Amino acid sequence: DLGKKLLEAARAGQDDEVRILMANGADVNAKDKDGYTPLHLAAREGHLEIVEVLLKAGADVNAKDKDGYTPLHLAAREGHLEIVEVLLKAGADVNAKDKDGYTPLHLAAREGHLEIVEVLLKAGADVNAQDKFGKTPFDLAIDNGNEDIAEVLQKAA
Numbered sequence: 001d002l003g004k005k006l007l008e009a010a011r012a013g014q015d016d017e018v019r020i021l022m023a024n025g026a027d028v029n030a031k032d033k034d035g036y037t038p039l040h041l042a043a044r045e046g047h048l049e050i051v052e053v054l055l056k057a058g059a060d061v062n063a064k065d066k067d068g069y070t071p072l073h074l075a076a077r078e079g080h081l082e083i084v085e086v087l088l089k090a091g092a093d094v095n096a097k098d099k100d101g102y103t104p105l106h107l108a109a110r111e112g113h114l115e116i117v118e119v120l121l122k123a124g125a126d127v128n129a130q131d132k133f134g135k136t137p138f139d140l141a142i143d144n145g146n147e148d149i150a151e152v153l154q155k156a157a
Contacts, residue, residue, distance in 0.1 A: 003030035010050055011041030018050050028059040035065035043083050044074035051083050055090045062091075068098030076104040076120065079113040084120070094123040101131035109137040109153060112146045117153070127157040 006026040009017035018038075022028065031037055039059045042050040051071075055061065062070050072092040075083045084104075088094065095103050105125040108116040117137075121127070130136055135143075138157060141150040 002026035004032075006030055006038050007032055007036070007041065010038035010047070010054070011045050013042075013045060013047040013050060015047075015049050015053070018053060022053070022057055028054050028057040029063065031063075035067070037063045037065075037071075039063060039071045040065060040069065040074055043071035043080065043087065044078055046075075046078060046080040046083060048080070048082050048086070052086055055086065061087055062093050062096065064096075064098075068096075068100075070096045070098075070104075072096060072104045073098055073102065073107060076108040076113065076116050077111055079108075079111060079116060081113075081115045081119065084116050088119070088123045094120060094125050095129060097129075101133070103129045103131075103137070105129060105137040106131055106135075106140060109141040109146060109149050110144055112141075112144060112149065114146075114149050114152070117141075117149050121152070121156050127153055 002021050006021045039054050064070055072087045097103055105120045138153040
C-alpha cells in the first residue's frame with residue numbers, strides 16, 4: 001500500500017521515498033488512524049522539501065485530523081517558520097480552529113514563537129480569536145511568560 005508508506009516516509013523525512021511513492025501514484029491525501037495526512041506529519045516534523053512537494057501534488061493544505069488540527073496548526077506549534085509560510089502561500093486557513101478552538105495564532109503565542117506570531121498576523125490571523133475557554137492568543141502568551149509576544153498582540157489588537 002503506497003498510502004501507508006507515504007505517511008511513514010513523510011514523517012521520517014525521507015524525501016526520495018516521498019518523490020518515488022508519489023511518482024508511483026501514491027495518494028497525497030492519504031489518512032491513517034489518527035486522521036493524519038502526509039502533509040500533517042511533514043509540517044509537524046519540519047520537513048520543508050517534503051511539504052512543498054506534497055503541496056504541488058495537490059494535497060489538501062487544510063486537511064484536519066481527529067483533533068481538528070490542520071498542517072498549519074502543527075507547524076505553528078512546533079515552530080517551523082519556513083513551513084508556515086509555504087502553507088500560507090499554498091492557501092492555508094490562517095484562522096482555522098481545532099477541537100479546543102485553537103487557531104494557529106493560539107498555538108504559536110502559547111509556544112513562544114515570536115517569528116511565527118508575526119507571519120500569522122500578516123496573513124490575517126484574528127488576534128481577538130477565542131478558544132473554547134474564552135482565552136485569546138494574548139491571554140496564552142501571558143500565561144506562558146511570553147511577554148514579547150503579548151506586546152505584539154496587544155499592539156495588533
